[PDB]
Homo-oligomer: A and B are copies of this chain.
Amino acid sequence: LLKPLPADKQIETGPFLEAVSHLPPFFDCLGSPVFTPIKDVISGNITKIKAVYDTNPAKFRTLQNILEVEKEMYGAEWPKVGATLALMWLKRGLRFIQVFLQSICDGERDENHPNLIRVNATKAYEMALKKYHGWIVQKIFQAALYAAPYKSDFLKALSKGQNVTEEECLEKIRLFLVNYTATIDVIYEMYTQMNAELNYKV
Q: Which residues of A contact B (CB under 8 A)?
A: 32-34, 37, 40-41, 136-137, 139-140, 143-144, 146-147, 202
Chain B: which residue is nearest A33 at the CB level?
B202
6 new A-B contacts at CB < 8 Å, known A33-B202, A34-B140, A34-B202: A34-B137, A37-B37, A136-B146, A136-B147, A139-B146, A140-B143
For A146, the chain B residues whose CB sits under 8 A away are 136, 139
A147 CA to B133 CA in the complex, in Å? 13
| Chain A contact surface mostly | helix
* Whole-angstrom distance between the Cβ of A134 and the nearest chain B Cβ: 9
* Whole-angstrom distance between the Cβ of A63 and the nearest chain B Cβ: 25
Chain B: which residue is nearest A146 at the CB level?
B136
Chain B: which residue is nearest A40 at the CB level?
B40
Supposing A33-B202, A40-B37 touch, asked if A136 and B140 sit within 8 A by C-beta, the answer is: no
* Whole-angstrom distance between the Cβ of A27 and the nearest chain B Cβ: 13
For A34, the chain B residues whose CB sits under 8 A away are 136-137, 140, 202
